[PDB]
């Protein structure tokens, strides 16, 4: 098995993962509108977060796909609309809001009969590169105490939103749920920390339980294989 | 090295070990980061400036420290920087250890760059979270530890390692020096308020004498900050 | 003949896709393109060019609405305090809106560069006096007093370098709390003799030097 | 971010922005008729007139995508007829009308099933750059008294326009929407102007308001941050 | 500038300003934009105009001109501009004002390309638009702005320096003098029925005197006209 | 134009194919890449500590 | 085998396309170009008679 190729951190990236499950039903309860905000979590596939928190800040582009079906899978008829809002840029807050309008917010149009869209997403941050943890308030200058649960979180490590409609001045016709798929490119990482052992209560600090586990057990007595 | 005021004298074994393979350097900067121009001398504020000593019993669990923190109120280092704009710095720490040739134990002096310690509370009998307010500027003295094995972090000791770090085996060394370069995404962040690194300093083999012998072991850490960056404001 | 798998993203519409698209009149040839002499290739022209800065903000009324530009010194406060030009951030809402520059700001998101203010003084030709104009970086608060402004980034202004007095601020940006304090202070009462009115006039005018530059574009305008 | 490339004009400039949203009813109160004229103006992207009188002069080619659906976004079998006649050529009045017919009004056919057109509109303009004011009087010659508010508006500005249809004898199967976004290619600007302040009123003429507004106020006094 | 009829001496302050960065040019026609020659020896018409002087009041809040159009029954050059078929010429305009050293103010002469000053009336209650006759066609007496934060034009003055200007302040310069060459999308267009450009001089600090001192300040006006391009017609 | 057959694989998608795809901010240009110390490209320098 | 994503304007049918399209005929040799005298390339020869 003598090559590096599967040992590169890219090989160890490159690979397509299901980060995003969006239902836009006839109607119901989540979303009545037919209209949804996607912020764009990298933790939206589980796995993936332990799996970069091997290392303090990395850096890559991603690359992202849309398939988009019925609950039952039947391929319809249906154009709809992603649009793909910076950082910095608002999010809409109504389906016939005028954000979706705004230039500045790249946007895709496509069909279900059409096979999914495919865009790329640069490297947002203002910062030189990415990083998932702060070891500080994210507040430059003097500490507000009115709230601390805004602790550890790097919001310029926010990179962007999504957002989906059903495109049409009136509402779908059909049940649809799109899928978002995300693979990271030019991926180059640099402080290697340890690996996760304990599971995840937040998603905004490594917080672990009041009760520690242990990665490995069951091993009865030192001298017994 | 004899740049500042007294040293501390060693037999100079090669416990040295550098951050990472590089050198901590100054800022390159002969292009257009900052056009106002930061002066730093080195040995102004690279005076050896050393903590509070601390006790080691046998049901001690381990210790850390913050770095850009640890100085505030601490050292004319302390009395610049927070009214300083923007810092940048490597260092030369030195964990000293002060033991008999009788007793035996194992520490582990590690360094970690992006150190968020957690932490939790009991669970949802009352409240969920509250993580401490005093979470930063952990004194000299402070602070010990909860969870050792996953550093309060959900993080292993077992691979901590994977971090520069050093033994003291009381055994052979008594004595560790690690530096470390400056780390961070930007070339300049603010300091108080982000805490660029962390130290520790967590025994394994938790020590063990025979009684009727000194049962407190002191480590002694000793600093040295080398290529900082400052020039002065108000007051 | 030639095999082709087509791809995703196929049949897409991308709002900022560039592509060579079909020509709908390939025969034409357009109207040839004259030298016109004030041109511009890049904003950032406009972003260093000195325009006027509201340091006045303060009226709402269009018989006043002219005052803004305009900022006073008279000689009723003495070695006391004058004006601070609030905040030392462009595109964040404030007097900046006015200048060129806060306004191409508020068509980004993020920016970095170093800007520079020049100050004019609109007062008679026989007025004399003093100003230390005072700068106070982000984190550090407004300065207590005269006395507490001194020991930091500051320029006293005397009316002997009457045309004018430039302050530049060294570098600013929008790392998504506090900015930079830009403070002018009375270093000394506004000293005249008879035949001049006891109060005189400052305009102040500002841009972004060389190194500025700003980020992705963002809109946000004001019509409906 | 030490690079210039983003303060590009082109770059500046370069967004496929919605600036037409025509509607097909099948029949109802819109246009009972079945047939459409798209004068083709640029403010139809609301914000880009400010963002464009900037400059005086500018020149540019324009690229024009043609997504249609229903007002549900349900995609369906309809072939319809987009039309670009040029400045000088006549507009169609009736459905039947002979200008459809007409080869020197360059005509686009697709299906909503097919993927949005997508065509290039270039510089048409007798003048070596676009004109967003004319500081006179668009006669040349001596003036006429019958009236004078033809003030400003440069005639020669006109870039075309479009039209569209159902194609057949017979109307229509289906209640359509036609949505047309343009995008500005090789822009070359001139001269830079003071940036609007107030809200137009009309839209061929920079007039203001009996009451002016300020574009930022509530400072208290000089003094106080 | 030794060329002319009589010439007026100036200190030669630091008021040198070109509009754009180019000199005003002639016509290159060894081209295809016409085969008939325009006519134009270099000093039939370089005459120093210079119009009636206005007033200055504290009062005042700034004038504007068109110049193509300001030139008609003016000079022998409206009686020249007139008769002709086609117009083309830069402007080197001199901005003089008199004042005391004991009179303070400040003034901004600039200089506007394509110039559309509105205008609108009351509301709908007595009349809905009626735009404006003497608007084009101003005269050497006209004209007052009415609104100059907007130029009453819906355009701030707070940006109006990205424009060619020049500024007159009583403390240091009181002669300005600024030059614009020819600017438009055809290298030709007729005069009298479009004003190519409009000029601007806008008090910002509004003039105050002490009182016991002549209130009025003189704003005199001069115009000396680079490059213009004819060569005849009828009468 | 130039003659082409569509060959299978048409229209599919395949998690891990590594493509070049629309680019969804083709005027952005990112920060720097400064450089920060402690770097690795390859998993195996772990396996050696 | 080779990749293509497909981009809008496809499937159109533009009126003023310059395109050349698939021949009816490949084999058919027309009659030659014989010479004839009076010739026209352009139409502002006869703006100039």
Redesign the interface.
Known sequence: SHSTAETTLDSFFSRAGLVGEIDLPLEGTTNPNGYANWDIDITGYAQMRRKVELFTYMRFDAEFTFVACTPTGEVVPQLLQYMFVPPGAPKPDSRESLAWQTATNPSVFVKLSDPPAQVSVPFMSPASAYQWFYDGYPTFGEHLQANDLDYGACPNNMMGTFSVRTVGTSKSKYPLVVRIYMRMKHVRAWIPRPMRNQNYLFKANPNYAGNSIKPTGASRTAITT | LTIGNSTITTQEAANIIV??G?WPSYCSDSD?????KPTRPDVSVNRFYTLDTKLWEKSSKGWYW?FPDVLTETGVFGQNAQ?H?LYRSGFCIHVQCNASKFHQGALLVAV?????I??????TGTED?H?P?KQ?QPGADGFELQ?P??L????????????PHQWINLRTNNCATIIV???????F??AL??????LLVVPISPLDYDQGATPVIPITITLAPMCSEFAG??? | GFPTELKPGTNQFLTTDDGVSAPILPNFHPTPCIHIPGEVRNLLELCQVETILEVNNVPTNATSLMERLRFPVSAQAGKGELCAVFRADPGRSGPWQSTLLGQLCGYYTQWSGSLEVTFMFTGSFMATGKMLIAYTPPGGPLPKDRATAMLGTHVIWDFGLQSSVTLVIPWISNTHYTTGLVSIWYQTNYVVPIGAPNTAYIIALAAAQKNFTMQLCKDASDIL
Chains 1, 4 share one sequence.
Do not use: M, W
Request: aromatic share 14%; charged share 10%.
């Open positions: 951050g990472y590089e257009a980061t900052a056009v106002d913050k009214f704009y970690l760059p992006e150190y968020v957690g932490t939790v509370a009991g669970g979270s993580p307010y930063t969870h094995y996953v309060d972090a959900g993080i292993p000791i077992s691979q901590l390692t994977v971090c370069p400056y780390i961070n995404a930007l070339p962040d603010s308020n982000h805490c660029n690194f962390g404001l108000r007051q």
